[PDB]
Amino acid sequence: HVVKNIYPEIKHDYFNESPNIYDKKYISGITRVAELKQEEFVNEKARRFSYMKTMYSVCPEAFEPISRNEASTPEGSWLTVISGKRPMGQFSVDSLYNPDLHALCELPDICCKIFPKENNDFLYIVVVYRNDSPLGEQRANRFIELYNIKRDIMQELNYALPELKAVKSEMIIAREMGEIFSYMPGEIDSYMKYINNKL
Ligand SMILES: C[S@@+](CC[C@H](N)C(=O)[O-])C[C@H]1O[C@@H](n2cnc3c(N)ncnc32)[C@H](O)[C@@H]1O
């Protein structure tokens, strides 16, 4: 149904478990044979979808850097992509029944790579990209590589050497992330200086 539709490769057991507290904002069932709420899911999704269709645009002949500020919320994270300002963004959802996530997946040439958040039981990462630009998938893939490097590093440090593991792992991949997220070169420098200070 609505979940396998946007997240084909999802674990089978997911639907055996019962709705967590976040799911319940949008559904009501014993398991994950639950009803979609008419107002909170169906009607919210349709409203958000209209909003997205209005803002939808095609990609420029070429992208310009956005400010990090335009993509610091989940909503701006995908808005900058659907309006064609940049080829990819990444955000999180506390429920695979998030109405925005479902609306996002119904836009032309808009793809979402979805997977469970590392070290979290309910959170999923969403990587949203322009399929109508060759940079879309490339950047989405490149993010997953950088993301895997970060989490591999942090897991290892967590295991054997935990001090400042998060900030250390940022020093390793943060500039590369900034670039693929299209942040302005100045904002990326400023972030590396913030990480450096954390030393
Ligand atoms: C936390 S992810 C958030 C992604 C955001 N929702 C998007 O779609 O662009 C942004 C990552 O980019 C890196 N980064 C580089 N420059 C940054 C900056 N100026 N502000 C925030 N993150 C920056 C950090 O590693 C950070 O984890």
Numbering used by the authors: 21 to 52, 54 to 220
What did the published study say regarding this structure?
We recently discovered that NleE is a SAM-dependent methyltransferase that modifies a cysteine in the NZF domains of TAB2/3, thereby disrupting ubiquitin-chain sensing of TAB2/3 and abolishing NF-κB-mediated proinflammatory responses. NleE-catalyzed cysteine methylation of TAB2/3 is the first example of enzyme-catalyzed protein cysteine methylation, representing a novel mechanism in regulating signal transduction in eukaryotes. NleE harbors no sequence homology to known methyltransferases.
Wild-type NleE yielded poor crystals, but NleE K181A protein, out of 15 Lys-to-Ala mutants designed to improve the crystallization, produced sufficient-quality crystals in the C2 space group. A model obtained from 2.6-Å diffraction data collected on the selenomethionine (Se-Met) protein was further refined and a final resolution of 2.3 Å was achieved. Despite the presence of four NleE in an asymmetric unit (chain A–D), NleE was exclusively a monomer in solution as judged by gel filtration chromatography analysis. β1–β3 are arranged in the left-right-middle order, which, together with the flanking α-helices (α8–α10), generates a deep and narrow cavity on the left side of NleE. The SAM molecule fits snugly into the cavity, which buries 2374 Å2 solvent accessible surface area, corresponding to 76% of the total surface area of SAM and leaving the rest of 24% exposing to the solvent. The interior of the SAM-binding cavity is filled with hydrophobic side chains, but polar interactions appear to play a key role in riveting the SAM into the cavity. Specifically, the α-carboxylic group of the amino acid moiety of the SAM is coordinated by the side chain of Arg107 situated on a loop connecting β1 and α6. The hydroxyl group of the ribose of the SAM is hydrogen-bonded with the side-chain carboxylic group of Glu191. The adenine ring of SAM is oriented by the aromatic ring of Tyr212 residing at α10 (residues 206–219) through a π-π stacking interaction. Remarkably, the overall architecture of NleE does not resemble any of the five families, thus representing a completely novel class of methyltransferases.
